UniProtKB/Swiss-Prot annotation, chain A:
The family this protein is said to belong to: Belongs to the ZNRF3 family.
Covered residues, full protein: 30 to 181 of 853
Protein name per Swiss-Prot or TrEMBL: E3 ubiquitin-protein ligase ZNRF3
Knockout or disruption consequences: Simultaneous knockdown of RNF43 and ZNRF3 results in ectopic limb development.
Residue spans, topological domain Extracellular: 1-146
Source species, domain of life: Eukaryota
Job description of the protein: E3 ubiquitin-protein ligase that acts as a negative regulator of the Wnt signaling pathway by mediating the ubiquitination and subsequent degradation of Wnt receptor complex components. Along with RSPO2 and RNF43, constitutes a master switch that governs limb specification.
Subcellular location: Cell membrane
Amino acid sequence: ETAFVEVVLFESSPNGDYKTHTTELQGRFSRAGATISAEGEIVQMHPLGLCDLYEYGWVGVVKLEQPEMDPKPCLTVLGKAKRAVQRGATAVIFDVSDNPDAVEQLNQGLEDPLKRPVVYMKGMDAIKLMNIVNKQKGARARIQHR
Amino acid sequence: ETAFVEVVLFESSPNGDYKTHTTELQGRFSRAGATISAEGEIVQMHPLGLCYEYGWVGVVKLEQPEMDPKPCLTVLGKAKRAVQRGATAVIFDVSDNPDAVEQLNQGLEDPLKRPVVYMKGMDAIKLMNIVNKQKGARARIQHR
Ligand SMILES: [Br-]
């Protein structure tokens, strides 16, 4: 199915209230990852980072590399996804704009699928995602399946 | 519509890995707030406490209406103020004050952009049973 991923940039007023600028992106729920909603603070995982505690229920955003960069990977992208969940991601967003074989890897379906959205994302939405993801200290990802 | 609220009790292990214990509950989406999903770590507000890290799930447990005759805030106000303070959904427990529910579901006001879930009877009982035990719990709030 299709994921409607909203990305929130939040900034607190001096008296303790918050202001937002949200941004609405689109990916795809994968065969491997459950098709539910979610939400949490985004940690930007280096793809090699999955081979440092975080509080629980955060949303990993890995951008996958040009495939010749990792000839013998530490893990299959699916491995990377299920390890993040062990490490306590509530969710998972992959940028595949560099590795569209991820899509086959991810949509296998052979295994029992994760209980959590593993969502992939490419082209321009991946751009606007990283655009914002690098900008400020904390950004909260809302994922829905409306 | 029925709010599927699911409550994680997380425990850190040797690896850095976590082990869970989900508790599967139910409520209603109120009309004061959007009918969508949400999650975040559960912060317990005292009802008079409306008078954090952005993205938290306020849980109020409302009380006998004769305990606070002149409220500093409507229950609607309470839900809106929590959203002002970065709440990303807001779950009340109307068990003791069932007139709140009318006030929430008036519809004169234009709705919040957040789940405003209410709850009662048994399912809140489990809910509060869990909030009071742990320090921190995730409220996944699921719109199916
Ligand atoms: Br692997």
